[PDB]
Amino acid sequence: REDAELLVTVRGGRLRGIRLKTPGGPVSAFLGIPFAEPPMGPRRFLPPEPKQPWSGVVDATTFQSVCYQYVDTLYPGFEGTEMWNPNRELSEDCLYLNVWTPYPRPTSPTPVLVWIYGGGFYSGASSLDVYDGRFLVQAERTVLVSMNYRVGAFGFLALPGSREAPGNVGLLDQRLALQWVQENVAAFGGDPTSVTLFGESAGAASVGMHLLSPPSRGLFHRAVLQSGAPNGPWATVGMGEARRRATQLAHLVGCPPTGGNDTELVACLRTRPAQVLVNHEWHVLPQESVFRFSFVPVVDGDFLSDTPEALINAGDFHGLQVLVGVVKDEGSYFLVYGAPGFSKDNESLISRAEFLAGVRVGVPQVSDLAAEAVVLHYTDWLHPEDPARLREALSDVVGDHNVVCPVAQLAGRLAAQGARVYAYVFEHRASTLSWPLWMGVPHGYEIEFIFGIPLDPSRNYTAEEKIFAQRLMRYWANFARTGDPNEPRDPAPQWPPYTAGAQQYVSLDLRPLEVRRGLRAQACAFWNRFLPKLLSA
Amino acid sequence: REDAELLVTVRGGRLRGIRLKTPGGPVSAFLGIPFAEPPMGPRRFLPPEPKQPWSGVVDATTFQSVCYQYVDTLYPGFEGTEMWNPNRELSEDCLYLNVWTPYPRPTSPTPVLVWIYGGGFYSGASSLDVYDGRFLVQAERTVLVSMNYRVGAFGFLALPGSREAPGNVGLLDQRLALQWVQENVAAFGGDPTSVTLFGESAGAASVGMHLLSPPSRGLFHRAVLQSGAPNGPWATVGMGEARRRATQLAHLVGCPPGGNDTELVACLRTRPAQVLVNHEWHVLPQESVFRFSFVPVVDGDFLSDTPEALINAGDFHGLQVLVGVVKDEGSYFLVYGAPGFSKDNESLISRAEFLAGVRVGVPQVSDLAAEAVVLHYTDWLHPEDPARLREALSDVVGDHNVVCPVAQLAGRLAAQGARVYAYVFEHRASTLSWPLWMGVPHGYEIEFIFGIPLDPSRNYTAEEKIFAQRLMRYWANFARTGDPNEPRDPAPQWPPYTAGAQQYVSLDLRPLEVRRGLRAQACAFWNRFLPKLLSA
């Protein structure tokens, strides 16, 4: 009648999973485990409530719904954008997580990788094909967990101080899932004393906010931040700007029938169909921009007691290992979403005039003086108008400002204040990539190799890329169980720690590890050391 | 009996010159010709007055007195500083000029070169050995004129608005000599319709100011600006700060103070010249290198606007300009106040010294501006490497004071009608007494332009002599035609500088090599960004 490996009792009740075929052998998957009560109706915008115990057996046999979110339509049918779009029905009933474990279940406690997807805090899902945990768990014999968390207004609309919309509830969704991991992962063979968070972009920023929030920090041990940081200019928002955005969203959908009582304002928002909120989400941004999202974590003293910058600088990080990195062309994806002259369908060889206009789109809402400093640093004054150079320069502007330099500041301060840090740059352009050649290794395209997707026989990767993907999974799993991506296998070469002075990182591509110095050191000194001084003067 | 070639009648009266030897043949020299009434006593600080005629024969066989000035004492007896110090007695009776001419004197109109010496507007003299005109005149058959002009407070103390100390009188000293050239150079064989001005440091700044002042502009036809420009942060001063400096000088020497300019000048006019000199450095507002107390003042008269303003607004069609810099404009000044520097060690400074140095090399700017300097000149892969910090602070001082002011002048003149030729001078003299770490310092191309290597009693190499002959030929080609290129191909040709291509040549023992950008990255900072920052 039943297979005992696919039957697990967690604190809330009994579950039943499925046996997954993988290239390397069987895996057990428990997909769509409810960890919170559904945040519908009166519970919209509220902190997650833990799932109430149930009698009988819950079937955890497929991914559950995607949290309600905007759906990208810029290049309809284009795989390079469709791969990030929801692959399940949209619902507010979306607080489910997924556990993958070896078959048979490990005998001794196994280290746990917990994945947190990105999507700008406005999109994403744990169900996307590229986040398929079966290949890591098979190849490296870890337990892998991933959760859904609310995005957009449903996760991050904030009327700060208000009780019916406190903000950051999507982060509370993540923390609740992490608490579930502590109470329940042992039932699957996982070690709750060896839990490594990892995430990418907004998921990397989320990992960092759990590092900086004491109530989250007791729930994990190690951290991996791929292409994102809590201190990025896009990842948090101030209390007053959160209130302005929430209030203008309400105003754009009829509430109140501007501002007033927070109770009455939210109650009105709660009567609007979810899709009506999503249809107005982008209209609350203060300007024309790229790499800016409407509802993101708010710095209000609760989750984050201070800005991520301050908490990073103040923190004692002894006993912490982190792995951080970026892709080679962090900035190119976002240019086709609004920078003038840019398209995935031509070479985007912009003019000087379009470059100067792009600077204000990619560095939005800074003084004319601050914009001048950006143009000074990124113009090559022996070739101020060469279109090819202007295209790469604008990519560097957006990439450095939003990802590389925030990651570099995080890496540097954690190292200087007690953490062992490892840093990479991912430099392989996947043979299957559908974006144009000028975009390089675009943001987000290391994930499929980390997750071992090239081992999927259904896909058409080269054999080199399969070997490469196996290499990355090992670094990640080695870091997960030891805090060090290196393996006692000296030639391999070795991946040295990142430090504030030497600033060493390794390149990840088909060739063997190559050590290098400085995460765009010259550029990041402008973003991390000089530009803040200028904006307060 | 007497030599006819060395007797000359100028509008003021009669002169007796002297024959000079060179290894290429004789030249005729007329040294110490008075062109102004001695600006003494009641005429201290006033505009110069033309020399009243004389009877008899003025003896023009010897250099005349040096205008009263500070004497460098940083390294007593050291050749590298002594060569710039006065080599004749000091006197306020110093307004004389010198003419060198071929022997026998030309009988057709010969192109004229007019030398204006540098010295920060606080020092200098036309009699310095390194400014000896005999080799250029023999080798390139030009007429060469140089004049003394008042420096320090005597030339540039300004109480703006006052008739008793108007300012810029040293500049007027220069203009009066240019007028004297127009009226008298033909008596020596010179062609008053082909006058090329050239000068170095403060002399190059002086040249640029005559370019931008209409009453001077009809007195010459082309300009050479070596390692200086009128828009450099040091070459001019605002009316308010000029008044504050003149006023503190009066305090420091016992003069007052409802206030009154007439009385303050009158009390200054009673002090011995040396007393003013003794307090000259103490009116500067802060510790600094490359700043000088009494410089040209922008008051709407000699200069009706700032030089940067006048550069931007000018129609420079019909102008040919030759401009350039040495390879290490900043090194020299570092040993005069940058913490950690000496000509006697390697000056391998620390990061803390580098940061303190930045406030000395970029004085009187906001903390934000200084931070922006540190951002640009730090290698953030090597923020504390002492050799890189020494080089970077040299670059800060050189770019801010010379290279980038020259690049801006060149770019805007070229984009507004002028034909511009740019060089970087990259040859370290075999005879150089400054340490190796200073490279090719400020001022050490002059001796090659004047052909001093041809002097056999000096210790230059045979290939250094050929180099001097090359440079003299470029300079003289430029004076005769507005084009340094030897009108003949291999070459490579020296192409004109333009705001886009930014082409210049390097001058060393190797043949001409063409390069792009007078430190375009750094000068974008100083010329385009930093002005915006200081406004807001």
Ligand SMILES: *[C@@H]1O[C@H](CO[C@@H]2O[C@@H](C)[C@@H](O)[C@@H](O)[C@@H]2O)[C@@H](O[C@@H]2O[C@H](CO)[C@@H](O)[C@H](O)[C@H]2NC(C)=O)[C@H](O)[C@H]1NC(C)=O
């Ligand atoms: C590169 O493309 C952009 C985007 O234009 C769109 O995409 C093209 C590939 C093509 O499908 C066009 O028909 C589309 O309009 C071009 O920039 C656009 O230029 C048009 C006018 O020419 C203007 O109306 C749009 O606003 C512009 N869009 C943006 C984002 O600026 C750009 O000119 C193309 N570059 C070339 C052809 O060199």
Ligand SMILES: *[C@@H]1O[C@H](CO[C@@H]2O[C@@H](C)[C@@H](O)[C@@H](O)[C@@H]2O)[C@@H](O[C@@H]2O[C@H](CO)[C@@H](O)[C@H](O)[C@H]2NC(C)=O)[C@H](O)[C@H]1NC(C)=O
């Ligand atoms: C390089 O020299 C400077 C200048 O020092 C002076 O000149 C030297 C030749 C020697 O005679 C020193 O004693 C002189 O003071 C040195 O900078 C000075 O250092 C001393 C202490 O060593 C300090 O009291 C002064 O303030 C410094 N002066 C300045 C202008 O900063 C520097 O130490 C020397 N570098 C070395 C020795 O590595």
